[PDB]
Amino acid sequence: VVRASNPAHNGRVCSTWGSFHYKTFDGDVFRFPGLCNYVFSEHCGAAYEDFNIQLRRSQAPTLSRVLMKVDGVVIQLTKGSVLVNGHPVLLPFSQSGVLIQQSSSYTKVEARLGLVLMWNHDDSLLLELDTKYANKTCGLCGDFNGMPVVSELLSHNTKLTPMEFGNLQKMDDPTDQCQDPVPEPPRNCGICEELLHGQLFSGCVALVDVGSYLEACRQDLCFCEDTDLLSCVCHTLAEYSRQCTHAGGLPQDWRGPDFCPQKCP
Amino acid sequence: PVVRASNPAHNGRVCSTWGSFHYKTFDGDVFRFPGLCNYVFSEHCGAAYEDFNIQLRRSQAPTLSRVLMKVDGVVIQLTKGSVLVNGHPVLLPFSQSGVLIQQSSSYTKVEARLGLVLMWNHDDSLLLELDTKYANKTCGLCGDFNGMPVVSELLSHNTKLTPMEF
Amino acid sequence: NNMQYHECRSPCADTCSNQEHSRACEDHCVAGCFCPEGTVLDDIGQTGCVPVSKCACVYNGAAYAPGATYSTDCTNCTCSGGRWSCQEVPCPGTCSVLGGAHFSTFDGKQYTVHGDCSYVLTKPCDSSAFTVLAELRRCGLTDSETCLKSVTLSLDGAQTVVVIKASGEVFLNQIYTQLPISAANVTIFRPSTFFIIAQTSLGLQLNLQLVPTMQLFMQLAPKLRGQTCGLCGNFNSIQADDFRTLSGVVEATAAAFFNTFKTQAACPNIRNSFEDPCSLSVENEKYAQHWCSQLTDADGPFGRCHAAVKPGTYYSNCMFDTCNCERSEDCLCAALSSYVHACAAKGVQLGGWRDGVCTKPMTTCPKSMTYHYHVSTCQPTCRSLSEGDITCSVGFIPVDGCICPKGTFLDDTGKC
Amino acid sequence: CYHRGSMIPNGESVHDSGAICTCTHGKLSCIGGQAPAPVCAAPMVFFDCRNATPGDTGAGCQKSCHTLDMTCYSPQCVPGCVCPDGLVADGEGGCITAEDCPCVHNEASYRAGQTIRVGCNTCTCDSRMWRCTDDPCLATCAVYGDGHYLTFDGQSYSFNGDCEYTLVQNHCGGKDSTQDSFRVVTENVPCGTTGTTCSKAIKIFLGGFELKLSHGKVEVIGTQEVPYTIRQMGIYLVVDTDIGLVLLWDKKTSIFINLSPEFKGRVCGLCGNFDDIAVNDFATRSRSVVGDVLEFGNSWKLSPSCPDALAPKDPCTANPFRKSWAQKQCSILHGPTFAACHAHVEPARYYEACVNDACACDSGGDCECFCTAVAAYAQACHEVGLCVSWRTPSICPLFCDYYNPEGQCEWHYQPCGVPCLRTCRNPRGDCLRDVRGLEGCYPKCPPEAPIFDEDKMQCVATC
Amino acid sequence: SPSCPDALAPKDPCTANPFRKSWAQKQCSILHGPTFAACHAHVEPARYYEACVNDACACDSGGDCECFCTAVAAYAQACHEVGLCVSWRTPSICPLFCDYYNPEGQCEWHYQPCGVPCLRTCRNPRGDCLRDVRGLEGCYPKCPPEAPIFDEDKMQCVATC
Ligand SMILES: *[C@@H]1O[C@H](CO)[C@@H](O)[C@H](O)[C@H]1NC(C)=O
Ligand SMILES: *[C@@H]1O[C@H](CO)[C@@H](O)[C@H](O)[C@H]1NC(C)=O
Ligand SMILES: *[C@@H]1O[C@H](CO)[C@@H](O)[C@H](O)[C@H]1NC(C)=O
Ligand SMILES: *[C@@H]1O[C@H](CO)[C@@H](O)[C@H](O)[C@H]1NC(C)=O
Ligand SMILES: [Ca+2]
Ligand SMILES: [Ca+2]
Ligand SMILES: [Ca+2]
Ligand SMILES: [Ca+2]
Ligand SMILES: [Cu+2]
């Protein structure tokens, strides 16, 4: 009998969002601007692999393909297309304990072995894993053991950088050879300070630390290619709201007709 | 379970029909029954699941027209010049699901690995040889296979059954 | 036919295939048609009952005749009385290092260890007349991507050392030389741009494929049976003792015996895990299955070889290499070329097998060279025309690659 | 890029001193920025090729207790840790003499004078070498599952024949030889729909006597005294003969035939000819070695009129919907359950057979197929002295308590079994070896009643 | 979930998979033989036999023995609930590894068809059995008089908790 009464479960959630921002299961937040095919998360802790999720970006840090192997089922998610075992399917689609459903903002794949994948319309990928997979996974989401740095950024008593770790988590295509991203020097570049530290997210500060997301918002504001500075930080705020919801908090509405508007059917 | 065997005389395991409606049961009772209908030659009625069920039919000379065998879900129909397995004609020799059907110069033999051998010879004789594990568990024209000729075959309720009635 | 009807004879009838079936019978006697005494049934030809001396024999599905003979590379058999009488003949042995990790010893034992050091392939145990070393090194991010970077042939107690690198460079006694070389007890030449062949006078021959990856085929004369020892076994026709280390016992795993033939202490000890690379990527598995299944396709480009060489091991090597290594096409081409070379060694030619995949090497040789699927001769040169003798081993397993066209001689500046 | 004087193509990587350096854009970039100068503990000293005099190997010819070849092969200098002159590394950082290196066997180290057991012989470590006796002993032919065969000489193959096949027999060439003629014959039956076939009954013809092991019972068909000894130990039924032939039968599909060395080169059948050579074990009944497994198997059918077998379909390809389950069930052979045995028995062929049988066991009884496949590897592990426990209440349970009499608790599961357990036929408690690791339920008789009567199947004070 | 797809009518398990059908019947005949002869007058085995055959026909993805064991254990529990404790498990028919629970050197766990509603434990020290559960068969401990208490927290026989 296992008891769990703490709703805060950010430790079982890994996500990617914005300009190549990755949050591991253990809470580590880094930036890896890789456009290749990488292992998002796979079950390497056992002889038989229950799941294997890979994500690929394109160029606009937008995801182009998500590949899932869930107990003999191969699910490929492309923009406006879902393939199960190589054939196109019409959502909602249920097969072999895997349920794929589309909504006005996300595409969700739920696997009864205890995994949830959410590809949001903000080009953000989120993954909820069961606690039974702790200390048994690998990929860009960490080893899922609780320690943010141990056994992920340590190859052999060596402190790995996020670039090195992300390149280590690469899994390329047969005929598609990919070049690792070139580490670029900083560009030497505070809107996010008002909203993130304001009362609008106050009921969320006590549960999820904002420093990492503050840095992520600064990076997104500096790295994005249009001068919609008020509307170019929606992704980081949405990710912070998602993490607050996953932490047992109750975020209040922060959008508006002119500030990051969302359209509902 | 170790079972010893020394006597090679195994006439108690063999039932056959030949000639002018002559029948020999597993227990050694030889009688005549001039029936031209479809009759149960031998079937495994002593268990919840039936391992085998063999039926034979005669047509007029007392010729044998059809032999129907149900062997563990395999249906074999033997007619003059035709062998059907699950409703499909087959070319002999034919091996499937532990059942081997082979034709020789004088007979057609169906061997079932569960322990039965059926011989349809060219002098119009149908001979069945059963494994000893089926003793006291069969019924049909070949008797109940318990080593006693009259008891449990010619008795319905304490009475005596003539060979025609049986 | 001439069978007779009897009331009591054994149902186990003796035939040409089984001439002692009656003796090994468990059923009682029955009535039926039986062959006359002194004759057995002819099941091969269905010609009734024939005497034992007239019984035919069946080999590879083809019926032979009494007195007819067939021959393999290792034996010579003759049919008599329905049975094959076989005599052994001298038979050279073949060791193979393919893909940098797949080893097949002289006795046919096959294993797969991903080493990270220089290892002793073949060597006499009681002498140092010759010694072959392989530099198997990890050439990828993971520990299961091994490349054969060089092959070392040592002769007469390291008095003649030839190092052949994966880039085609040849070093004789630490001096970068130019092929062909006729050194002490060894001749090394280049039949094509794809292969380097080194033949020694001790009964040893090395075929080294350099395109796309370095692979080795060693051939040993029958005079060295039971005398060599290394990663290629002791060449004594027994597979059980091919994992016997120099200590004296036979190991149970390929990795444990493999790690005992290191040459340096700092080299890691390889432990064989149970990884399945094809399971780690959908696209890689699809590519490997699509392009490697041609080895086992009976009606494909390699179908004319399934009787000579069994393609199962080559199919497994193709799948593993294609799914594991980063350059999937290179490893797929290496596996296909290894199977083609084995077929050519068996005497089967599979020309035209590069249509569909591995097309690139056919269009990469120098300006005056052209590709050839079958190269069983030696390259003619201007020096060969002048002197009259060409430095070659005359007889070698046919190879493929880009050579000078017919009627054209290779000039000293690498031009036809 | 160039490393150690060797050209490294772009995209390739090298592994030096635990550092992985990849060659990209003509530059060798190492994981972790730069490899730090490695430091070797005393008495090993780091030798570098900066001051490399001609003819000096450095660390390129430094040997260890694992490098059994002491010849120096390096032509050029290689940096690394070097022990003092005339010393070799022991794998723990120290330096010892070559004669003092411990012996290595199956990923283990044994000091001088330690004893290991291979086959029937005993090997003692002595100055890096193994001293072993040269006593010949038996060979085991193992047939299990959907026609998985391993011959006396070690030839492993898969054959799916529907008829009765001669597993082993003597008097093959010349038909006279010596001894008394024996013949072990397997009876097969289709098991699945993909074309696979598994054994149903085993018939042993010895002298004028016949034993039929079928279902779960033995029949003495018979015709002197009976030259058989039937003994139920563990899950196995052991038939012992006085000619040197032992048969282990798991009572469902598995047979293990142990043949004494006196029968070398005098046997034939699907189990080979027992002459230490595995390639020639594919000898047909026409006495010709063939390459086709189907032809060799079909040549050994008892009845020439039985139809010849054909190549079956790939089970996991014909039945993909089961494949995952198979791969999820047979992964026990790769997990921590058998981790101690991976160094002594290679599980590759056992895992392949397990997956194939689970894929092909589509007509009913998947658990029996899986349990037989795993028990083959379990018996292989037990034969070499590894008492590995793998049966859980969810994985192939055994109902030992079924054998407990009313108000008694004696029967317990034994992985390696009880070789010498006191019984009526063995009052002194003797064990002849020759059978190892027969797992199953064995009785633990109390001191009050210490003799196990098999016929009564009870613990009694005296028989 | 309203968004979850509706379930459709499944195929006939013994028609889609006829090659299993015979086995299924031969496996499920235990529900009609002498094994459950005493229970046949108290629990009707018709629907249980039908479910057994259908499950064995449809258990084609792996683990048909689990399907068969569950189908027969349903009828076994129905029999046990009405006072009839039949012993149907054999080493070849749904074996139970009770010996797995024996501590090193001990022999306590036995298979009980009826179950032991009031075995003595330290959560019910007196030994009172609450009823309300009948015939929960399986492995139960028989603690010796030296240690007549069964501790489930540590799972062994002890004198007191
Ligand atoms: C995760 O597993 C490794 C495996 O040895 C272990 O060393 C480590 O302590 C584990 N971490 C946690 C948090 O349990
Ligand atoms: C055959 O079955 C009947 C019916 O119970 C029984 O009375 C008789 O004793 C049995 N005979 C033998 C030989 O078992
Ligand atoms: C086998 O050897 C004999 C005698 O040396 C020879 O005549 C015969 O041709 C050989 N077999 C073949 C197939 O050449
Ligand atoms: C060739 O080998 C033989 C035997 O190993 C040796 O006697 C001879 O000297 C070698 N040739 C040369 C040129 O050294
Ligand atoms: Ca960690
Ligand atoms: Ca009677
Ligand atoms: Ca050998
Ligand atoms: Ca042999
Ligand atoms: Cu959540």
Residue numbers in the entry:
A (entry chain B): 68 to 126, 130 to 259, 264 to 339
B (entry chain A): 67 to 126, 130 to 235
C (entry chain A): 340 to 755
D (entry chain C): 763 to 985, 989 to 1228
E (entry chain D): 1068 to 1228
Copy the relevant paper text.
We present a study of the amino-terminal segment of MUC5AC, one of the two main respiratory mucins. In this work, the high-resolution structures obtained for two helical filamentous forms of MUC5AC, determined by cryoelectron microscopy (cryo-EM), are described.
In addition to the filament maps, a single-bead map was obtained at 2.9 Å resolution. An atomic coordinate model for a single bead was refined, and the resulting structure was docked into the two-start helix map and replicated using the helical parameters to provide a helix model. Within each MUC5AC bead, two copies of the D1 and D2 segment, arranged antiparallel to one another, cradle the central pair of disulfide-bonded D3 assemblies, as in MUC2 and VWF. The two interacting D3 assemblies in MUC5AC are connected to the D1 and D2 segments from the two neighboring beads through interbead bridges composed of the TIL2/E2/TIL2′/E′ domains, as also seen for the related proteins. MUC5AC is more compact than MUC2, smaller by about 8 Å in both the long and the short axes of the oblong bead. The MUC5AC VWD1 domain contacts both the VWD3 domain, located near the edge of the bead, and the C8-3 domain, located near the center of the bead. A further interaction observed in MUC5AC was a segment of polypeptide upstream of the VWD1 domain participating in an intermolecular β-sheet by hydrogen bonding to an exposed β-strand in VWD3. TIL3 was the last domain that could be modeled from the MUC5AC cryo-EM density. In the MUC5AC cryo-EM structures, side chain nitrogens of the three histidines in the putative Cu2+ binding site were seen at distances of about 2.1 Å from a central density, which appeared at 14σ in the bead map. Density for the glutamate carboxylate was ambiguous, but 6σ map density clearly showed the side chain oriented toward the histidines and their metal ligand.
